[PDB]
Point group: C3
Chain length 230, copies 3
């Protein structure tokens, strides 16, 4: 929403990519462009690991609702495809990816969060696929992302019932991996990233793909199936 | 077992369907007929959500053991097929379904319980697929129902070892979603149902099916495979 | 490593098979041969259940690193194939199998552990697929074994991040089923085994296979795919 919604900072073995559009980090075309460019920077720098953060208010409130509800079909399709493409890129990323969930993560915000190898949040941040609560069916690509992380029963309630998770319930459900106090969420994320950069990169990259093979295939299908959804 | 084993009561936005055959709510042909008819009533009333309860003694002790062990093959086949058909109907039901687990849930009782979008029990109610303990192999349709809800490791022990779950262990395993005191299990179920009726029905119905697609397909196969089991 | 690395002791309804090569119970050809022979003994004795233990130092430190890194391709292939064959044999074993995790279980040690119907450890024993930390990609057969037991999110971190689990985190993740004090790990294992011997054997054997059908098929493929890995 702001003109310059993503910052990139390299600190030794890691790259820190921060979303702040001055509002709720809506994942519209400009934000997606800025995130892809930031990842290109990390590629160029051949960093050991990535940390992705939100701002002080949210991790992200999801796709841009203005575009989603504008009545223009192809722009909405393209926004959704771009968001799930970014999810694909992060889930298959050859370096460890750590998410600093610095506030609430709703819908595409929660799906983006769910692409990190490690995810840190504070206890009062809501994580929810709210689609059903607002009259939308969850796209197949999103379901596959959630199915990769959420326990079988948590997955059931997260989808059909739009259940909100947080703190201990998010940890148990598999929506996050670590709970920390708000003031140290980013620091904990950076610490984990520095540790994971110590793993063998080749083995990490190859193994993560094997552990996500079916999901990645289904996500590709889901991306090519977005049009059909509309 | 009693002549009139199911009651149907509409309360504002929900329908409450209660099993009480005066004994252990055996899921024989009469009980299955009564449950299907009660669901037909909820369809006619276009209710916002369903609550299904057991009695003061059990949720259900499962299929009628008398019929199961009578030596008459086709009646046993038909009873099993009907039970898993009912499971299918509830898992695909277009409105939120909340189970009030008012006592122990054994075998088909536990599988029926596992068809609710939300399931509430008290801490001392046993939930168990006891088939292996009594010399029976678990039908594929039942396995698919359990695999939809139980964590990977809980699923292993629930099946091959006939493990009994309750209270905190049932919650962790995914055999239930909420623990409440016995005297408020039904009230909590009704409260949740009223909340879920507030979700968008079209989106709930479409999303729940997507979140259960593979299970539903496998359950259909399992229903058509019952004969082969005998 | 020692000349006589496995002991077999029949106690009433169970057989106790103990690994102790005088070091870290490396799963090389001699150890695999001794374990298979011990299982043959249990077959001959038609025991009610199996307990498999490590020594005072570890459950097992995994495959023999000397052979793995010797530069001789076929011996390394054969060692890996034999280890996953043993895993297959135990996962499909017609009697209940209980693992007494008497110390750390690393890599193939953790995969072997994950083949038990019930697994008991003490709280400070590390359970880890350390492959990525040491520059190796996890074999598909190993991934399938882990995917059978670890929750969706634990599976992600166990593989790509070589996460170490122990105590409460191992229990939650699905790397173990029971935590006990070190001095009673074996006793608890034997107690559980005696209980499981009371289950109907025919039903246990048939049900466990159904609950593991996809994993077993994929493990067979993974065994035939070991060569390709090298
Ligand atoms: C289609 C898909 O399958 C999934 C896609 O992601 S669709 C996007 C779905 N996302 C949503 O519906 C978000 C619902 N909103 C929220 O959860 C909360 O607003 C929030 C947690 C994101 C922020 O909460 P908050 O800090 O307390 O601020 P709040 O009082 O709620 O209002 C947020 C402001 O940003 C706007 N906003 C919130 N989410 C937005 C989004 N995804 N796109 C565009 N604007 C958004 C609100 O309209 C409001 O704007 P104004 O105050 O200027 O009128
Ligand atoms: C074939 C499949 O794959 C799965 C199918 O579901 S097969 C059904 C498998 N179900 C069982 O084996 C049930 C085993 N029984 C139980 O778990 C317990 O009886 C219970 C939890 C259901 C009730 O426990 P309880 O309130 O303490 O009563 P309890 O003292 O155990 O006895 C229950 C009474 O109902 C009967 N009963 C229990 N389950 C029954 C069933 N599923 N069908 C017909 N009768 C049943 C018992 O025979 C006993 O009858 P009587 O006292 O008249 O002789
Ligand atoms: C290829 C695959 O996909 C998976 C296969 O399993 S490959 C095997 C991977 N396993 C490993 O890398 C094991 C790494 N080592 C460990 O985790 C720890 O050594 C352990 C937990 C096994 C034991 O810890 P410990 O009791 O504190 O003893 P520690 O001080 O670490 O040293 C262990 C001793 O046994 C040796 N050892 C440890 N694991 C071994 C293995 N898998 N094969 C052969 N030797 C091994 C060490 O070299 C050391 O030997 P020396 O003291 O004689 O030089």
């Amino acid at each position: 929403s702001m003109s310059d919604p993503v910052s990139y900072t390299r600190k030794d073995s890691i790259a820190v990519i921060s979303m702040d559009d001055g509002k709720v980090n809506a994942l519209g075309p400009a934000m997606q462009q800025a995130l892809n460019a930031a990842i290109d920077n990390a590629d160029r720098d051949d960093v050991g690991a990535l940390v992705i953060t939100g701002n002080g208010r949210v991790f992200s409130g999801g796709f841009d609702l203005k575009i989603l509800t504008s009545g223009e079909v192809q722009p909405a399709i393209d926004m959704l495809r771009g968001g799930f493409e970014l999810a694909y890129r992060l889930l298959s990323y050859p370096k460890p990816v750590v998410m600093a969930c610095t506030g609430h993560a709703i819908a595409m915000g929660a799906f983006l969060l769910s692409c990190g190898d490690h995810r840190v949040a504070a206890h009062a941040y809501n994580i929810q696929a709210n689609e059903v609560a607002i009259g939308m069916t969850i796209p197949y690509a999103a379901l596959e992302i959630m199915k990769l992380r959420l326990t079988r029963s948590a997955y059931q309630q997260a989808t059909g019932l739009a259940k909100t998770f947080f703190g201990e319930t998010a940890l148990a459900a598999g929506f996050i991996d670590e709970i920390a106090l708000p003031e140290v969420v980013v620091s904990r994320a950076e610490e984990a990233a520095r540790e994971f950069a110590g793993l063998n990169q080749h083995a990490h990259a190859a193994t993560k793909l094997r552990s996500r093979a079916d999901a990645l295939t289904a996500i590709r299908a889901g991306i090519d199936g977005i049009a059909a959804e509309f």
